[PDB]
Design a protein around this ligand. Structure first.
Ligand code: HEC
Ligand code: HEC
Ligand code: HEC
Ligand code: HEC
Ligand code: HEC
Ligand code: HEC
Ligand code: HEC
Ligand code: HEC
Ligand code: HEC
Ligand code: HEC
Ligand code: HEC
Ligand code: HEC
Ligand code: HEC
Ligand SMILES: [Ca+2]
Ligand SMILES: [Ca+2]
Ligand SMILES: [Ca+2]
Lengths: 495, 495, 495
């Protein structure tokens, strides 16, 4: 009966006919279709967004996404500890909700539960049922978490969660959210986040990267489609002055982007980017930037060396540093923007080659693992598969040397920003002129942008070692210049 | 001839007859008994306190206690290093003898030698014979250590050792120390520690936890029996408004506590607790608290959330912080008080199930290992034995996740106390009012009590994750409140 | 024809005849000898300094020196990171070029390339060809590095490289450098370093430690021969009031030192020592000390407890600390001076026994490995070979316990110097008297000398645990004394 459907749903016909999934009957994925025909287009069919339906025919992709592994060093790894990825986090992000809890990432299957349970999300409201002993459970959100209710309080939490956060954790609102989270769907940017979490049962769906109608490689993230549309010729995924994306607009309500050829750069960039998904402040007037404003669901697609200019051009910053008052940018996991134009990218390698390598299942069917891999833990498939001359030690050696050298500059930029911050408080206290203190704030802005990008980014330089060195040494230079300007000023007091 | 003995030693008869050790002749453990009969009760028999006599019939318990293992990461692990368990120790304990040396614990067989040789004990007087190459030797104290004499000095040492320390290192003074170390035995609290160390040949004896007369599970520690007697209904080991302990008082001179059923919580709490075993100061008048005072050999049996109130109620603190002058409590290894009322305790699990698991000896006799185990290093017997569904990775994952999350809050509380301490010195220097500085000291008291308990405790949260989170976030809140009060005050100067 | 040569080269005859290499024809190592005879001693023969000629008859020594290994934790390990060997490097060495980059050592075959490429050498001018993916390549310098040219700049670099540096990286200038780098050879101390690097093709040559003419164990380093000649009776390698070295002086131009018996202490001390190879300042007048001055290529051969006195006696220091102005000594890898008079040295063990242990090659020929070994990574040959009762765990345990205890004192001395430095800036700012500030500078001098020696030295105490404890506790004492003097002074302001 698809022809009857197709009379009214012509884009679906275009994706589905003569495709890999051509023969799949509609009722496989959609329930209540008879009521939809009979009663008309008031009675919408039900589209349950759900991995297990793809799993029925794609079991190795489904099993590997859900497989439970246990890293013997644990998870919930706070970054802000002496031996961690961001040892001076509490000082350098003073004034930001990340200081309440920010841990290293873990597996994809945990993404909703970890978003909802982290100390910075919603005041500790949502917790794992049964506590720590069930921290490794996968599946449905509300089988794993419980809701302690709106009036419960837990000490040293924050309330940074909002609806836009969910757009990088699940495909469950694909039909229930208007492009950008503008008003008109069941939920939008201004929704109460605690109404929204109830509807998220599942982590990133299979449909996030694969069209259900015709199995075409795709993107569904609003912010990512929008950024590419803004900059169709020069954006990080472009080639030859265009990008391999066709935007399909459904009813004026929501878009997808279909690509002729798999580009896991774009598919992983639906989440692995710097973004704004939060309220902020305007640099010019200091006016609030609320969820009313499109700037609160936004993807720059710019790297470390471009981002301070970019946020100044859209008159936006995230928080004032608690000590210096500097108008800082908060950075988050810019892996796509870092990877852009690195040695591997310019070689045509994509994220999935190192992070979703080929493994054999079952009997012995070849597939891309959909439990994403930490390359250092799997160098034979993530690296040696292509670098056939490498031994596992060599692969490890190369990953660690680059991170070693990058980390040395990261720790040195932190030492310098801490010096900047300590010098500034001294300079204040001895009331050095607000003019001078303001020159120092620009120094902080610059040194912070060129530093925090790399604690937020998760490769410690491996994704782009040149850009990391350039950025971090820029940060150091910025901070030592601020420290010299302030000390010059502090002397000039009793002068 | 035991009947003749029994005419005069009626408690022994009560422990020994119809027991597991009924048939053991007295002369097995006691020498000079004929002179005792013949010459009378002036000539006391000799009771050599000594593991090797139990070993003669209990070889697997004896061999496993003495077995030498070599951890390839070494021992003598100072806590106060950037990657260690207490990275800000030197700043936060400024003014306390722990700043001279405080290392992580190692095996039981080393306990006397490590107490005597640590840099904080007695000015470096006692050293390992032959130096580092014999650091792993077990056995008799004075076969392993040498006495460089009373006038030798070693730089950057302290002289914190006293007799009461020995009561958690050996059973060797069981007959030679009057309850609490009151005057009347060969040694008491006011003895010169260098007279006492000469009499300690052996680490914790087999008799510390097992009655020699009838093999009944027991405690011998004075401080522990006393605390339970103070609080027989509500103490951490109680149940149903009483505790499973019968106190046996010998001649008015020394007590034991026998339990009808093995409770390794109590048996390990003879040492693994917070204690006072040191001189201190009175909070009200600032008067010294010397060894004359019973407060110097004392067990609170209270957890992190109760201890500041408890030490205020007995008008006692350990040291003024070198910078802030805050009247701090010094905390030590409160493992029993932490474990109380945690998930495993409420499940009826005891310390020995994870730390003394079942192993097979010899031929293949089943026994509890008496070389106490670090569970993460032995998850198959310490964890999987009960959690039969766990893989070794899962067990490790659970231990490390909890420690990971706990440690993130510990490091964040340290960042905050360091901020408190740095802010205070600023506030002083700019002479903010001693009234305000005093409000800040209370903040320090509170934030320190809720922080240092967890560096002293050895599980990094695993023993009680809820109480750890509650305490540490309390510390943070306390410190950020102090820092806000002081900064408010520091501005109010040039105001 | 050697007799004809010998008529004019009589020292060579003395080394070569009746030796292990007696039969080797001259033309094996020297080309153009006929032109030298025919045209005379204007046409010098060519002596290509080159491992591969020794390799032709000594293949196992050559292969093991060049073998490529890949440490899976990587290389380029910056010291100045929280978990590294010198976590407070940026603060404590403020004002020195080491703050731009100082990493842990790696294999011998990398020594030239790492000297030329490090961020502190020559402004980033020299880089690995092909970047990170060729960081593990060995062989010829200029097959591995490229020269970006004199006008290229890279941010956050330094320009500390000079010709004297090369003397601890290669044997390539053995015939082209006059003793001490005095003027007269192709290169000397005042040469432009960028003229010199072009002539260094190879790392340390086989000839650095082995005479080519007669295979005698030897030294070629100018600074080392000179120090031993200064102090022939009492120097660290002496015995019975002399040293086992015969100095051979060729034409007044360059010296070797031949030893009757292998002493790898001396042979490794050609580089593994504290040295001055840099310009400096005079303590008395503050006058520059330039390459004109012999003090710029100099070996003290003194340990941690002697070096401050030694540098004061030759009126030399390296840099003023950027904050305190203290006239500091910069220390570098004093492994020979530390090892002197330690337990292993007094037992007659030499560096090569632990670092070049016996291995079997090829078929199964026994040899000393010439890829120098990190003992902890090879305890069976580096330790158990002599300590036959040791298990690999025990060996590891002993190395790590000593480093553990040593590191605890190192981190505590760093905490104290940082306190000194922070206190001093406070004391300045509140202008405490330059007299008092000067007493503090002496405190800094002393605490720095007794601290930085051990971050520079590479064993973390294992080479000499007693001297390490003595030095580091001396540093702590020095710093806490400075901190007390300054605080006493800072109070005495508003007094
Ligand atoms: C699972 C394998 C599917 C099969 C087979 C079919 N559809 Fe589908 N459809 C499915 C998903 C998961 C979604 C949600 C949105 C997304 O792009 O992933 C949908 C959505 C539709 C819609 C809504 C389009 C819009 O206007 O915004 C229509 C109208 C739809 N699906 C129709 C449709 C028809 C007519 C089918 C048989 C020919 C059919 N679908 C098969 C998943 C699946
Ligand atoms: C948004 C819906 C996402 C998309 C699309 C991709 N990733 Fe992701 N990733 C995301 C989250 C929120 C997390 C953290 C989950 C948590 O609960 O902590 C991650 C985690 C990873 C990791 C770490 C994996 C692990 O430790 O086990 C990697 C390596 C990873 N992500 C890479 C990755 C790649 C290559 C993608 C395209 C194929 C990709 N991610 C998609 C969010 C989302
Ligand atoms: C091989 C040439 C890679 C490509 C292409 C991409 N990544 Fe990567 N990633 C790489 C390494 C060696 C590391 C360091 C940590 C490791 O595990 O080895 C990383 C790190 C990540 C992380 C951190 C999680 C983890 O895997 O440890 C993420 C979240 C990640 N990378 C994502 C990512 C994305 C989105 C990519 C394309 C834009 C990308 N990676 C490319 C190796 C390689
Ligand atoms: C093929 C699909 C690749 C996979 C998977 C990985 N690498 Fe790679 N690498 C590849 C190419 C074509 C290049 C370009 C230069 C060249 O040899 O042609 C590289 C580059 C590197 C480098 C240098 C990187 C830099 O920033 O300059 C290293 C150190 C490297 N590659 C190692 C590496 C490792 C460890 C991988 C697993 C994470 C890995 N690569 C994946 C081809 C491919
Ligand atoms: C070792 C297995 C023992 C055997 C058999 C017996 N005794 Fe014992 N006794 C032993 C120890 C290790 C100690 C010290 C204190 C402790 O409680 O562990 C003792 C102590 C006694 C005492 C002193 C009691 C007091 O008044 O404070 C008496 C009087 C004593 N032991 C008597 C005794 C008699 C009469 C025995 C044979 C029937 C006998 N003991 C057996 C260890 C051992
Ligand atoms: C006082 C006499 C003690 C009793 C009773 C118990 N323990 Fe203990 N323990 C004590 C000391 C002084 C030390 C440190 C020894 C040193 O020289 O450093 C310890 C050490 C442990 C450890 C660490 C073991 C190791 O690293 O190898 C654990 C796990 C341990 N202690 C647990 C433990 C348990 C469960 C007890 C009751 C069965 C117990 N201890 C008794 C002091 C004393
Ligand atoms: C299993 C449910 C446990 C019980 C009951 C007890 N402990 Fe524990 N302990 C546990 C873990 C997982 C850890 C973390 C470190 C590890 O090695 O895995 C600990 C830690 C200790 C330590 C530190 C020494 C060490 O084992 O690493 C001590 C000294 C210790 N625990 C003592 C102790 C006491 C006295 C207990 C009953 C009050 C107690 N533990 C219970 C696991 C478990
Ligand atoms: C390699 C195995 C060699 C053989 C065989 C011979 N010589 Fe050599 N010689 C060689 C080296 C590597 C060097 C450089 C300096 C050093 O001491 O390593 C030399 C140096 C000479 C010199 C210069 C001495 C000086 O006056 O400063 C002479 C004159 C020399 N070598 C002569 C010589 C003669 C006459 C030989 C055959 C009998 C001969 N050499 C063999 C390496 C080798
Ligand atoms: C000057 C010509 C040297 C002589 C002679 C010796 N060593 Fe050395 N060593 C030197 C350098 C410059 C380096 C660093 C190389 C780099 O590129 O980083 C080293 C390194 C070592 C190491 C570390 C080895 C490694 O990590 O793989 C050791 C253990 C070592 N050196 C010891 C050593 C010994 C025992 C020597 C005499 C036999 C010796 N070195 C000679 C410089 C020179
Ligand atoms: C065995 C008794 C040794 C002797 C003799 C020498 N060294 Fe050593 N060295 C030793 C150990 C156990 C360590 C600690 C690090 C390890 O790898 O085990 C060291 C360290 C070094 C280093 C650092 C590089 C490294 O090997 O990790 C160097 C550069 C080094 N030692 C040099 C050196 C020299 C020059 C010696 C004679 C003066 C010397 N070592 C003696 C063990 C032993
Ligand atoms: C003609 C008139 C038809 C026919 C024959 C079918 N559908 Fe639809 N359908 C139609 C309209 C106008 C609407 C939506 C109006 C609106 O809310 O904007 C729809 C909606 C759907 C949806 C859901 C979109 C959402 O969840 O927001 C699905 C999944 C869907 N239709 C499927 C479908 C199938 C399988 C049909 C043949 C059985 C079919 N439709 C017939 C209009 C018409
Ligand atoms: C009756 C009178 C007896 C008899 C028949 C025995 N003992 Fe004792 N014993 C007795 C007294 C009054 C004392 C101690 C007086 C004092 O110092 O307080 C003791 C002491 C012991 C002790 C030592 C206690 C200590 O070390 O402080 C031991 C181990 C002991 N007695 C054992 C013992 C045995 C085995 C006897 C039968 C052979 C025996 N005693 C007989 C009084 C009397
Ligand atoms: C007599 C006259 C002879 C004879 C028969 C030989 N050589 Fe030499 N050689 C001689 C002199 C005076 C000089 C150097 C003068 C100077 O520059 O100081 C040399 C030099 C060498 C060198 C090089 C030293 C350097 O590189 O600076 C070598 C390697 C050398 N000679 C080797 C050599 C051999 C193998 C001879 C026999 C074939 C030989 N020489 C003959 C003087 C005389
Ligand atoms: Ca952002
Ligand atoms: Ca205490
Ligand atoms: Ca030096």
């Amino acid at each position: 009966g698809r022809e009857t459907c197709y009379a009214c749903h012509t884009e679906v016909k275009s994706l589905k006919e003569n495709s890999k999934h051509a023969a799949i009957a509609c009722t496989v994925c959609h329930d209540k279709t008879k009521e939809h025909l009979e009663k008309g287009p008031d009675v919408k069919p039900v589209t349950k967004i759900d991995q297990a339906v793809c799993g029925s025919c794609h079991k190795n992709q489904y099993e590997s996404f859900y497989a439970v592994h246990h890293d013997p060093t644990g998870a919930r790894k706070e970054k802000g500890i002496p031996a961690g990825r961001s040892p001076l986090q509490d000082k350098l992000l003073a004034g930001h909700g990340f200081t309440f809890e920010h841990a290293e990432p873990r597996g994809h299957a945990y993404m909703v539960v970890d978003q909802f349970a982290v100390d910075r999300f919603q005041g500790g409201r949502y917790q794992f049922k049964g506590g720590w002993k069930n921290y490794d459970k996968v599946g449905k959100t509300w089988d794993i978490l419980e809701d302690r209710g709106p009036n419960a309080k837990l000490p040293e939490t924050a309330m940074a969660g909002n609806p836009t956060c969910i757009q990088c954790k699940s495909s469950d609102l694909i039909l229930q959210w208007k492009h950008l989270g503008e008003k008109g769907g069941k939920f939008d940017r201004t929704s109460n986040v605690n109404d929204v979490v109830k509807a998220i049962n599942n982590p990133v769906g299979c449909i996030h990267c694969h069209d259900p109608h015709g199995a075409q490689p795709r993107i569904v993230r609003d912010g990512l489609i929008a950024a590419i549309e803004k900059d169709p010729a020069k954006n990080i995924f472009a080639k030859n002055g265009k990008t391999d994306l066709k935007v399909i607009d459904f009813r004026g309500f929501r878009k997808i982007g279909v690509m002729e050829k798999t580009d896991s750069r774009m598919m992983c960039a639906q989440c692995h980017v710097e973004y704004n998904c939060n309220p902020g402040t305007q640099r010019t007037d200091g006016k609030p930037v609320t969820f009313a404003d499109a700037r609160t669901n936004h993807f720059p697609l710019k790297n470390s060396l471009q981002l301070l200019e970019h946020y100044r051009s859209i008159d936006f910053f995230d928080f004032k540093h608690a000590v210096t008052g500097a108008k800082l940018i908060k950075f988050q996991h810019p892996e796509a923007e870092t990877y852009a134009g690195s040695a591997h990218d310019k070689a045509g390698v994509q994220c999935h080659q190192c992070h979703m390598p080929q493994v054999k299942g079952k009997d012995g069917k070849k597939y891309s693992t959909h439990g994403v891999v930490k390359p250092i833990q799997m160098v034979q498939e993530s690296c040696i598969s292509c670098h056939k001359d490498y031994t596992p030690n060599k692969a490890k050696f190369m990953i660690e040397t680059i991170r070693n050298y990058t980390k040395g500059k990261m720790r040195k930029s932190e030492y310098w920003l801490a010096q900047l911050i300590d010098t500034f408080a001294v300079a204040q206290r001895e009331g050095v002129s607000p003019t001078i203190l303001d020159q120092a704030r620009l120094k902080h802005e610059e040194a912070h942008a060129l530093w925090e990008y790399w604690t937020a980014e998760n490769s410690d330089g491996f994704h782009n070692p040149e850009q990391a060195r350039q950025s971090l040494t820029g940060s150091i230079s910025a901070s030592k210049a601020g420290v010299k300007l302030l000390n010059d000023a502090i002397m000039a007091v009793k002068q």
